[PDB]
């Protein structure tokens, strides 16, 4: 067995944003297949941080994307070897943060690394005053090119304030070993923070995850 | 609630594996049901697989004899397919399906599972 219908995930994230310097560790669990998933995360090292969670949530999982039979599940078919992502996160007032991720399986449970890096956001914008809350529900387009999966988004995160902030994003998918590329379709994706502490330190997280075609 | 049958069971696994369908069947008296499998795999047309029937004999087509077995646990309203010795071209969408007619036709099953993935990969 390689993926049953519920896995487990661990993840280890280190990061930089506007030079400060974090590290975070987290445990996750979902339904591969229903593209349903959750995960609690806790600040390790660098805490608190001094700029909005919303940048770093969507960093924490498409193996857990519900996919239609017609359309193959790329990221899935990766395993056991797994796969990497690049991203790339392109903000309104040119904030940006870049993103790596190797993705494997041991024993049993997906396990992730992320590295981060976000630089020029504001010191007045939203970011860094913790003025978000929350993103709106994403269409991603994704595409082969190149012999990897690619992905675009025009993502929306709300602002406290009852405004909006956008971000184009940009991630390429590799399986580690050659697997069946699918054609264009749309993953159609809604996070959530469903928990936290005072100084977001410790946060929970839900995502709803499905491919569709186009 | 409707009547409602609700496979579980699969996922991916690598060539010479082994996986093992569910069906749970709610809102019928379900010892009275044959429970029928069938598989769709991309691009190819839906193909009977196995049933068992209310009297408990079972019916396996040729290309999985010996590899695929079904049985039922009427007191726990579930029917079950064990898949061993998976092959590559066994990769399809797995549905059940029950009817109180003897048939491997679709055109006379009355109710349909939603399906459950089944990928069996090649090690590399």
């Known amino acids: 067995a390689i993926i049953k219908e519920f896995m487990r995930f661990k993840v280890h994230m280190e990061g930089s944003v506007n030079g400060h310097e974090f590290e975070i560790e987290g445990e996750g669990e979902g339904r591969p297949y229903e593209g349903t998933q959750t995960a609690k995360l806790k600040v390790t090292k660098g805490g608190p941080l001094p700029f909005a969670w919303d940048i770093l949530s969507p960093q924490f999982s498409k193996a857990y994307v519900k996919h239609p039979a017609d359309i193959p599940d790329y990221l899935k078919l990766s395993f056991p070897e797994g796969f990497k992502w690049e991203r790339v996160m392109n903000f309104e007032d040119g904030g940006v943060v870049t993103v790596t991720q190797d993705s494997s399986l041991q024993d049993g449970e997906f396990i992730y690394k992320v590295k981060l890096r976000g630089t020029n956001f504001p010191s007045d914008g939203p970011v860094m005053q913790k003025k978000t809350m929350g993103w709106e529900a994403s269409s991603e387009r994704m595409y082969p090119e190149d012999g990897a999966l690619k992905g675009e988004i025009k993502q929306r995160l709300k602002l406290k304030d009852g405004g909006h902030y956008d971000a184009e994003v940009k991630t390429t998918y590799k399986a580690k070993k050659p697997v069946q590329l699918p054609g264009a379709y749309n993953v159609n994706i809604k996070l959530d923070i469903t928990s936290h502490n005072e100084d977001y330190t410790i946060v929970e997280q839900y995502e709803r995850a499905e491919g569709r075609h186009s | 609630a409707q009547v409602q049958l609700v496979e579980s069971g699969g996922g991916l696994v690598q060539a010479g594996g082994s996986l093992r369908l569910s069906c749970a069947v709610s809102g019928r008296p379900f010892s009275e049901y044959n429970l029928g499998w069938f598989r769709q795999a991309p691009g190819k047309e839906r193909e009977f697989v196995a049933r068992?029937?209310?009297?408990?004999?079972?019916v396996y087509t040729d290309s999985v004899k010996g590899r695929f077995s079904a049985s039922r646990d009427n007191a726990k309203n579930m029917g079950y397919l064990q898949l061993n010795s998976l092959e590559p071209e066994d990769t399809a969408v797995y549905y059940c399906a029950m009817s109180r007619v003897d048939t491997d036709s679709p055109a006379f099953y009355d109710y349909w599972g939603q399906g459950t993935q089944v990928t069996v990969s090649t090690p590399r």
């Open positions: 068992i029937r209310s009297s408990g004999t079972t």
